[model samples]
Structure formats: C-alpha cells, structure tokens
Target: HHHHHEIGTGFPFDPHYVEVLGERMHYVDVGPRDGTPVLFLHGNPTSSYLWRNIIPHVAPSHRCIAPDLIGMGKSDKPDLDYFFDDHVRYLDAFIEALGLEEVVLVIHDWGSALGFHWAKRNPERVKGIACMEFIRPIPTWDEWPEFARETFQAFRTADVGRELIIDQNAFIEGALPMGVVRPLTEVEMDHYREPFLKPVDREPLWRLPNELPIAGEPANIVALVEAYMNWLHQSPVPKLLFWGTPGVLIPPAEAARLAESLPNCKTVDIGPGLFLLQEDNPDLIGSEIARWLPGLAG
Candidate 1:
C-alpha cells in the first residue's frame, strides 16, 4: 500500500501548481526559471508523469514544464465533455497563465496534436519542436492498422466504449501496457491508475479514443490537424522526429514521408516501440532531445 502511494518516485520533481480556468493545474517546473522554456505534453490516459524520465535530461539547460492536462493526472477533474477543443482551451489558458513565450515544444501522441496546433497558430512564438508517434496525416478507417482497428472502433461505440474504458479501466489496465514493448511494473501502472480511481474519473480517457480523427468523422479535429500539419510542412523551424519499428501512430513509412516533406526535419530510429515510446526508450528520447536543443537557439 505504501509502495503503491510511492508510485511516482521516479518522477523525482518538485510539484508545482497554477490556477487555470478556475481549476488547479498540476505541473512539474524544473531547471532554471530563466532558461528557455520547453513545454512537454502527453496524450490520452497519461499525464505529466509520462515525461518523468525524459524531462531531467533537458532540465539543466531548459525550463521543462509538463502539466497534467486538467483532468488527466494530479489536476482537478471538472465535469465536462473533455473533448479536444476543451483540452485546447485549458492548455491555452495554462500557457498564458504561466506567461510562457517562444516555447520549445516536446510532444507525443495527442500531445503532438495539441503542441503542433498551438505552434501553428503562434509560429512566431515557437522556438523548435520535437515530436514522436504524433497523430498526423489523418488516417481513414481502412488505413488504420488492421490489428488495432477493431479495438479502436469498439471504443467509439456507446455503451461498449463506456464499459471498456470507464467501467473496466481498460485503457490503463489493458491498452497502456499493450502499447509498450516492455512489461510495466505494478508501480508504473499504479501511478497511472491513481488519477482514475473511479469510473466518473475515467471520462477523459473515454472521450480521447473517439477523437482519433479516423475517417474524418469529427471534421473539426481533422481540420485542425490538417491546418497544423500544413503549417508544419511550410515552417522551416527546427524539428526532430523519433520513430520506431512498427509504431502505432507514425510508422516508419509515414515517418519517412514526413522527414522527406518537412524542411529541417531530422529523424532518429528509436528501434522497437509503439505509441508509448517514452516508456520504452526514455533515455534515448531524453538524450536525443538534449542533443538537439542547440538547433533552437538561433
């Protein structure tokens, strides 16, 4: 029990809080306050804890701020749809509240969507970007991987989705581990499960699966992803992509296409991994990000 409570010991950062949209937002503010701010973002069913290992590498020379996206981690879980737009609104408020500017973004999964969307709208304020397994070039239902399509489709279903995600906590108990190549220890799983101790607390996790932009059903998000991706293609800002074998979101083929099309984009092979590459390769991920920081200085 005490060990369960000691779940996030690996995070090893001082907890910081800020007021955003009348809710308390929890984040880790590490490294020098005056250092160039590097904001890290995490996707569905995960929180700031996701970046625990990765942030330390960049913290010495950069201000690393990784927030728990309103309801997903140690933050307040206000009752709402927790849709993509809702998250964007809270994220926007969080950045403005902290008065962060010219931010370097390190993002993954849906975190990539949020970071890239903001960078697109405020291109002048973005220093550089490093992303992995981001959802981009929106896929058709048929284009979605055959192995994953059935499960994802089921998550979009009404009652079944609720039962799987909210009732059963399948996202944490099933999907999170499945996405990682290594076995997750009980400690790691407990940290993730700590935030969603009840079914009502699982609302955000449930909503995110349906927001995958598959078949362009949610035209709003699909359009947003397109607009940001278009900006990514046009902008010459320094960029880094860490791709792995048979990745879930951006596989090797897609990664190659992006690296070829985007200006100043560099790709790194992170070996075997899936959506949760941080879990599989935080050392390489963090070190590579540290190694790439100088490109943003100019």
Candidate 2:
C-alpha cells in the first residue's frame, strides 16, 4: 500500500505574497482576520503547504499564517546569501508587515531555531508557543544525541551529504517515509516534489544544509543558534511540545528535555515518526491543537 496520499492541487487556502526584506515571500493567510494569530514555521525542504491539513481545522477560530522562508518553498529563491539569521530577519519583516501581535508560534525542525530566535527578540508580542519535532539548545551539551551529532557532521562536511541534501534530496526526496509514520500515496509524494522539477529550480535547496550551525562555526547560524539557546534559558513563554518518537531528527527524548526545562511547558507524544504528522494521525493531531488552542487564550 502506498503511504503517500495525492496532494490536492486546488488548495482550499489562498496564497498571499508580500515583498519583505527585498524578496517576494509566499504565505497562506487563513482564518478570521480578527482571530488570534497563529504563525506556523516550517523546516528545511518543505513549505507552508506542509500545514494544509491543519489549517482548515484551525482557521475557523484562529488566524493561521504559514510563510515559505526565503530560500525555500514557493517564495522567490534568490541567490542572495541564505542563513539562519536571514530567515529570522525576513520573518520579522513578514510579521511586522502583517501587523501580527500576541502570536501563538508553531515551530518545526529548523523552524524551532528561527521562530524562537524571533520570539526571544520580541517576547512581549508572543502569547504562546507550540513545537513539533524540534528544539532550541539548552544550557549544556548533554542533550546532543550521537545520531544528531553524526547528522550534524554529515550536514556540515560530507560531500555526499551536501550533494544529497542540498542538491538532490531537498526537493526530490526529502519528505519521504523516513520520519513519517503513515505511508503516503504516490500522489501525495508528488505534492512534495512538484515544486522542484529542474535542478536549477532548486536554488534554495542548496542553501539549507550549508547554513546549519555545526562544529561551532557557521556563517550566520552559529550566533543565531546560540542566541536561541540563551532565550530558551531565559524566556518564560507558555510552550507545548508535539513529539514524534520514530522521527530521524528531533526525537521524543529531546522534546522531553525541552519540556523539563520550561516552567509552563507541556508535551504530547504523537506516536508518529516525523514530518507530515497530519498524514500519520491527522485527526489526533488536529484535535490536540484544537484542545490546546482554548487553553492558550486562558
């Protein structure tokens, strides 16, 4: 049986484009205009489309905004330097342009670092946070898993790693079944691959892995990750973790460690592998967010 489902072309949501930070960024702005703002940040190799299933459920009562970070997704893949700090800079402009206030942040993968970096800077404007399969660094290096270390090393220096992730895999096969618990139909897989048809089309793909902060050195990500870690230790935001145990990156123990550090953080084990948690358990994850939404306002 095919685990991937066909991605529907006629997405129920509408695309909104805004020129922020010198590039045209693509985002989906759904839900009532006056409702509480919920910003969804995606990680490498995926775009706002990742949240398609979740948006419809949450839009009725909340404002759901998911932006394709500068170097990824439907946004303009400019050849300008891409870095973690650059992502945060663009996001800041995106938020300011939209006039979003008192936001509930939903972060995943690299989104954890980018989103929290922004939250740390504008803590007063953030109301709450919801995380899935990601974390900002804590006080010590104890949480770094061996696989994570290996993966980071691969991401930083391996020729195959750079070629596979940054070049071929980013658009071609990044969102496969590795981290996903549910099987996707071929059509669904197509949705993930549809954006990058040609090698040249994937200009943004190469920038992601090259931008990671590994070996304590990065052009821009080093300081950004460090700042996010410092904020993790200092910020008092209400946080929640939606963790996937079988996911290759950001496993359950890491999520648990994050929860343990935060005074008001809670965690829910989604029992799935990784990306496309909605595909794995749409009903369960949707309902969990719905239940949590009400509490955020209280």
Candidate 3:
C-alpha cells in the first residue's frame, strides 16, 4: 500500500490505515509506541485533521490516535445513507480491529456518540473521557432548551435540511465557520472538504443532520443516550468536559446538566470560543486537556 503524504497537509501525523469491516479506515497515530492510548473522534465535515494542534501538545504524553469515522474521512464510505446505526457498526468494528484497551476517549459531536456507545457497553475498557460540544439527551425535545429544539427543528426539516447539508455541503462551507469563533484558513477548509470530493460520498453528511432526536420519534436513540447518561452517572471512570460560550451547542445549561449527571465529572469553560472550539482556541484547550489528564490516568 502506498503511503499518502497529502494526508499530512493539515493532518501532521504519521498516516496509517487498517482493515476494519472489510474496508480500510485511515487514522493518525503518534507519540511513543507504548504511551497511554488516547483516542480522538471528530465531528462532521472534518477528519482526523480536527486534532492537528491538540495532538502535538497531548501526544508527548499519550499515544494520540485519531481516526476518520467511516464515510467521513479517508475511511471507506460504502453504499449507505449513514444513519446512526451505520456509524456505530463500523466504529464498534474499528475499535475491535485496533485492539484498543484502557483507552482515554476524547470526543466531540458524532465523536461523542461513537465513543459513548462503546464506553457505555465496554465501560471496563475505557480509562477516561474528555468531551466537548456534545449533547446528552434530555428526555424529550420539549425538555430541551430553546436553542437545541430550534437547532434540531432545522435539521429535521426535510427539504431545507437536504438543501443545506446534502445539496450545498453546508456543514463544511457554513456550519464549520458558523460554529468556530475564527474562520478557517483556505488550506484548512480544503482539507475538511477533501473527504467528500464526490457528491454521493456526501450521503453520510446528508444523514447525520437527520439523526438528531426529533420530538422523541427515534425511541431507540433516546434510549441509547439515556444508557450513556446512566453510564456517566454510574461509571467510576473520570470524565472531563470542555464547554464553550453561548453561541455553541453546549451552552451553560447543557454543561450544567452534564456536570450534574457525571459522578466523577469536572468542567472547564474554555470560552472566547464556540462550537468547534478546537479551531478557535486549540492551544488553550490542548493545554487544559494536558493539565487535566494526569490525575485521571496516571
């Protein structure tokens, strides 16, 4: 297999791929071969490139492993619309293929879903959690804060949602910039767009927006999130949350909910940034993670 230097553009780690689920999934593996295994899962419209800055700082002390979710990065996107089960299936397979044990999970957005799914079922295997811009279900949409309700309302809208996420690639061209406090560099935007160069490959992007719980319709999804919340409250594993300011997904109320639910939870409001805070304030977030992880794992 030929190694791809192009992956090293915005993603500045050693590029590697492994067969999982009969498909090749790409990832960035760095730091000491035997260092603490730290796995990073990124959100939509982005790849392992999301951790470009965070890894450099954290890698010195941890084996930072960031993989492109199936259908989202260099990973193979088979013929499917990429619903929530589709994502969880490949991710479950990937973790097994990698033989990851006692992992420290750092997650955001879809990353949060994939990581929590594994951690809840395989709590004994996860060492710690570092989460940002993720949502834990709040029973039902009526119970959700106005921002979340309205946000999902937009995503659940069939015609408008399709126009934005599928037809226009708004998650890359719009949502990323809209969420980040800073606009992405031209090169940075290009790297994020590289995964879905073909239109049909954007099927997963089209599907994610539709997965957000819409007025309790997806009973299984709510059940799944509740299961994760149960693990958050019951599991002895240390949990750390990084929250942004008002503009982002995890506003104060949501953060407070998470803080209250996690028995071993700690929170740091890394403000002056929003939504995709890694892009807005990478060094600060990286420093916070670097500072916080020691007591949890070592």
Candidate 4:
C-alpha cells in the first residue's frame, strides 16, 4: 500500500488489506490460493511494492504474499512511537491475525528482524528463509569491523538522523535511491515518496535508525537476534542468502561469516549492489529465489 488513493498502478499486482492488530495492514495476496505460501516482508521505507518483480516469478508454483510493515506502506499508521518493539507487536499480530502457517519467509532490512523474531518462536510454521542486505547483531562488540561500527555511529546521532530522516526524509528521499542498481523510474520514486511527504508519516523512518543496537542500548533486541542466529545454525530447514558487494550492513565478509552458522543455508554472490537489493536487482533476485524454493522445502 503506497498511498490512500489506490494501490498505485506502477506495479501490476492486485492489492489487498487485512486487519493486523487493529491496523488496516496492506499487502499483495497473489498467486495460487492452494500453492505453497511464500511470505515476503520488506524493510524500512518500502512496502509490498518492493517485491513487484520477485512475486511474479514465483507465483506460478507458490502463493506469493507480501505485506507492508505496520506503519510503512499503505498499512494504517496509528499515532505511536514506531519503536522496534512496536513493530514486533504488530508483526506478531499480523501472523496470528492471518493464521499464517508453513510460510516460506523472504525478508530484508527491518523486515528481517520481524521475520526472524517470528520464525524463531514459531519454527514449526516457517518452511524456509531467504535473507539479504540486513543488519544482524554480533554476539559482542569485538565482532564488529570498522564499517559496522561507523555505520551505527552515524545513526546514533540524534540530531543528524532526525534532520536526514525526519525533516529531510532522507531514508525515503535519499537512502533508498542511492541503494538502487536499477534506479527507480521517476513515477516509481514518486510512489515511494508520496507516503512520507509529511513529518508525521515519517516517524517510523526516524525511529528505526535510532533503535540500532549501538552503544549497548536496545540490548534486548541484540539478545533476541543472538537467539535467532542460534536457530539459524540449527534449523534444518533450508535458507538462502544473496550476497552483494557494497552492502551497508551485511557485507561480503559478514554474509560469509553469518552463512557459516546457517547449516542448510546456501549463499550466492549476486554481483555489485548496495543495501537495497530489490530495487536494482529484482530480476536476478526473483529468478534465483524462485529457482531455489523447490529444493529448499524438501
């Protein structure tokens, strides 16, 4: 859900809405009703629209469903703090509300956090995971390299993060565009821009960077992620990782290191791209993921 007017026609999928935690959560429920369900979760400043290319490719054999994370996209935005825990509450409700079961999760960014949190708790319900370009907690600070330290350091700046994300809306206006290898069309950019035009709608953007597990704040989430990483290491269910160069959070070395713990996981080098891989490399991502699913489930 990009805006209130209608599901923007920039993308071809039919839009749908479900009541997730009393909020009108928007999503795209495409593909077969009876096919294996694939749940696609997007990260910050984007919606189900992010999966535009990925869904179609997998639709032939799977039920492709992508939802807007609570306050982002066309989902109803209630006046709340948009903190990390708030998102987890909404996401947990979304799964419970939808009676989602046996889902194959495809996630990125904050979407990864929501997906992993749910998956770790409901391992029986999740069949597989496909992850990329997202942050994960290191067990300790010594694990962080210079770039990782500096990246979160930038977000920890209260004044700068707000000016860029809250006031200037840089997460949507600047950060998103810079990540695209296949730079969005002018209209596509407009679709992404319209939602956060006002400061009120940009609260989630401002709050997300602030919740970074930096400076030993948000210790709970870091601990939660540590538990999930443990699950990844043990979960026999297959996981797929797409590694791209110039990544903001999960760089090549980090992805390689992380994949080591995911026993059934297979990581692929998808060439050069930044944090936002879906915008630029959708075709590659969609095709590879679609190809990977059959083997993943068994």
Candidate 5:
C-alpha cells in the first residue's frame, strides 16, 4: 500500500512534512503556532495517535506537536539500519528544522528514552516535561520485575520477538490487554490497527522492541540508556508524572519511587492501566495538566 493512503486513514492530526538532515520527516503541527509548544513522543507498538484525544484539549493553549517517530507512524519506513540513537538524531534534526524553542515535552513509552535524551542534550531549549509510563534505567537487577526481566531476555535472543513486536497489528492486539484496565471495543481495536494495513508498512514497529538497550550489551544502546539514567539523576527541569495504577509494564511502585526522588516533580495517579489512562481518565489527566501549567511558570 502507498504510504499516503495509510497515513490518510489512520492519522487524525493535521500532518505536516519537513526535511530534517536530508531525510523527510512527518509530524502533526496543531493549534496556534505561536502558542507554547508541547511535543508529545510515543513509545513501542504505538504512534503519535496515542495523544489524539488529549491534544485537542491542550491545543487551545499549547501548540501540540506529535511526530510519528521515523519508523513508527506514517513516517518513512525505509529498509535502513535503525537504532535508538537514530531516533534521537532524527528528532534533534526535526526540532531544529522546525525551529522549536522552549518546548514542553510530553512523553510516554519509548518516547521517554528519546525525549529525555534530547532534553539532556539541550536543557536550555526545554521548558518542562510531563511523563506517562516514562523509561528509567535501573542500575541493578533488583529494579526489574521477574516477568519484565524475562521479557527482555526473550527479546534479546528470539527472532520471533522482532516479528511479534514490529508487526503493527500484532503489537496493537497484544498490547490491548495490557494497555487498558477495561476491555476495548472492536472499533477501538480497529482504530489502533488502522495505521499499519500492510505487512511491510510495519517496519518502524520492529526497531523499538528489538533495539531496546537492556542488559547493557549493544555498545551504542548501552551508552544511550546510560545517558537517559544520568539525565534522570541530574536534569532539574520541571516534571509531572501521570502514572497509571495498573500499568502492566511500569508498576505504580516504581513510578512513586521516581516521583519521590525528583525534587521538582509531582505525581498524579490515574486509576487505569497503561494505554487507556488517557482514554479512561481523560478528564483527570486534562485537569491535572491544566492546574499544573501555571505553577510551572512560577
């Protein structure tokens, strides 16, 4: 299927294309361009569409920019080498190309790794950060749950891990159970699956899970993950944690621990699972952000 056809169907945000460091990148530029910029970054098995509902709520006061990271959404899925640094490079170029200044980053999933890396590199350009299911590099084995540790181990060795994760439909279907506290409707599932209609189109989906820098093996990824951890410890930027209570991947205890450690951070417990915390508790999330924005300026 043609890339335009797929993007036309699945993406609801007003899409714009920009050439960044010689590669054409796609992103959604919504609300007034003059408004405060909120860059929303998504993680594995999901795209910028994760913020579709939330953007409209925040767009009135913030220029909400969400990109389908290079391999993920309607962006170019060239059969090229992919890695976490590749994502950071593309995003860095994208931000520079668009001339975004003083950005308020809203990140989730794999986005946590990418966004935090970017923030650490250009702390002067950042205004604040809001995280949901954000990534944190654990120093030792004790920080990870047994199932999570096992899952990473499986991803490290199994070819099937790549096939299962990179297949957009498979990723969405498998994630549905883990993402939400409640069962999803068929239409809702289709909404999530609508982006990757063709098999080849799922190329970007493959990069994230397989390339996750766990166990500190792949040299470049180990460095990137380490940098992410270093930023978590050092960056003094304003932050908010909108944590889902029953999130399958990131337990609430860990989220609480991070919140406790960060001096300038606050946490809001949204009583839903991973994905639908926005869908199930949109009002709470929206209201919390609304209330928090003013204090951030102070």
Candidate 6:
C-alpha cells in the first residue's frame, strides 16, 4: 500500500512498512510495480529521506525502494546492539520480505558496504550498482587521513562517543551540515533530528563509526570488506560510479583507481561535494543513473 506519510516538505513520498525481523521497517516505494527494482541504501545518521530528490529521476521506469535501516529513520528501534552485522541481518530480511529481484543498488557510506556484501553473495540477483563516497579497500590506521583520524578514533571511545553523538546530537546538528556543501534548511535539519530525539535513541548513530573497519580490529568485518572489494574488482555487472571532489570516503584518487581496476565501470564527477553527494548533487546523481540504467540491459 502507498501510504502518504510525509516527514517534511522536502520528502513527499509515501511511506510503506513491513515486518522485518519482528520490527517495523519503513521504506519508500515508488514508480511502476512491475518495473525493474532499484534499491537505495542510506548510511549512518541518514534515512530514506536522503534519496528524496534522486528517486524521481529513476522512478519513471524503475521501481525505487529506499529503506531506513533498523534503529534509524522511521523504523522501529529495538533493544539490541546496533552493529554492522545487525544492520545486514535486518536489511536482508527487508529485501526478502519485499520479494525484490534483479535489484539495482544505489548506495553510499555504510550502505555501500552492505550493498556490496549482498551483491557479492547473491551475484546473480544484482543487475547494476551505482555508488559514491563508499567505504572500499578498507584502510589501515596509518593510511587514514590525518584530518578525520582523531575524530573517528574518538568515536570508538565509549564516553566521548556517547557525549558527542548521543548527548550533543552532533551527527545531526554538526556533522550532517558539515558533510553537505550547502547549508541545510531548518526544516531539513529538523527531519533528520526527529528520529533520534533522546540519547537512548541514538545508539545506531553511535555504533556505526565504531564499526568502521579500521586497522583490521574488527577482523571479521574487515575480512568481509576484503571479500566484497574482490568481488567488485572482478564482477561483470555494470557499475556507475559518482565521485565528488575532495570527498570523504572515495576520494579522487580512489575513484580513478576503481575506474581502472573494476570491470564494466563508468565514472562521473558530480562537481564539488563531500560525504553527502545526494544533498550536494542529487540532480547529477539522478540524471546519471537515469542515463546509465538503459545500458544495464545490454
């Protein structure tokens, strides 16, 4: 059912919910019912609201489905540790519950990690992938940028992380605006702030930074990231990559390297953007995906 549950003025799409892992998972499903399904996965601290602008460009011909990861956005917050693997389990169930097939993935940040993991395991199910500013080729502590290193390192610390992300609401109030190029409207910021109203509600936001596979500490996740990077290098599936100048995760050099290394991949520059390209260049991302979609059938 297409339920018109509006979060704010910027997000006009109808919301749909399904029982995933006994919790209510919220998603936005648009376009033709029989159209090729395109799944948009958002990263930490953001929700399905992140894709409000991009969905319209592809929705004309493809079914666009964007879900809020469990414990984030409109989805139900359960009493459990919000780990990287936990998100994968809930997301996998959400996809299964919806019965999506031949999926096209549009992902960023942690979404890229989750999307790549799914695509690698279920190779035949993925038709194409469009990703930007994602975590790939997991970096050692030494290889990380000096500018952001201390911040992420602090996130791993319990007291500091709780104080910054939960108590202060820094992810929404501070980091979200900093990630995007333009200033976010008060309404937009309010929408992002809505879900995590209390300190207890901000667990998912706090957990994600700690889950970042740095220095191979979380050996299992780092190993899994390696597995997906290997699949991405060899997979014959069509890929449309977007890179922003001086970006956070996938920078210019990484973008160049991937274009050369990954098979059947096309790269596009969305102009000046950082971590949140959708907020910065949604039109470019949307139009590029629209242009790239037809080629996937060939």
Best by TM-score: 1
The TM-score measured for candidate 4 stands at: 0.89
> What TM-score does candidate 3 get on C-alpha atoms?
0.89
Cα lDDT of model 3 by residue, 84-150, tens digit: 8988988888888888778899998888988888898888888889989875664566665564456
CA error at residue 284 for candidate 3, angstroms: 1.7
After superposition, the stretches of candidate 1 with alpha carbons farther than 4 Å from their true spots are 1-9
- Report backbone clashes per prediction: 0, 12, 0, 1, 4, 0
Q: How does model 2 score by TM-score? A: 0.84
| lDDT at position 91, candidate 6 | 95
Q: Give a tens-digit lDDT track for model 6, residues 1-298.
A: 1111122238888889999988999999999997579999999779999999899999998899999999999999998789999999999999999988789999989999999999998999999999998886555777777766777777787999889988988777877887877677788888889999888999898888888888886778888899999989999999999998878888899899999999999999997777888987788899999999998875
Error of 2 at 259 (Å): 2.5
Worst 10 residues of 5 by lDDT: 1-10
The collision pairs in model 6 are none
Error of 3 at 48 (Å): 0.8
Off by over 4 Å in 5: 1-12, 138-153, 166-169
Cα error, residue 237 of model 2, in Å, equals 1.3
Candidate 6, TM-score vs. the true structure? Answer: 0.94
- In angstroms, give how far residue 113 of model 6 lies from its true place: 0.9
Cα lDDT computed for each candidate against the true fold: 0.87, 0.69, 0.77, 0.77, 0.70, 0.87
Among all windows of 10 consecutive residues in model 6, the one with the lowest summed lDDT is 1-10
Q: What is the clash count of model 6?
A: 0
Q: How close is candidate 5 to the true structure, as a TM-score?
A: 0.84
Write one digit per residue (lDDT tens) for candidate 2, span 1-298. 2244333333566779999877899999978887678898988667886777777667878988999888677787676666665677788898888888789888887777778888888888788888776644333234445534555445555575666655666334743544466566566667667667766655455556566554454535677777777776667777777777665456676776777776678888877556556557655566777778888775
lDDT of 2 at 28: 92
**Candidate 5 structure quality by residue, lDDT tens digits, 70-189:** 766667765556677678778888888888888888888778888888888888888788888766544445555564556555544447666665543455666444556556556666
RMSD of each: 3.7, 3.6, 5.6, 5.0, 5.6, 5.0
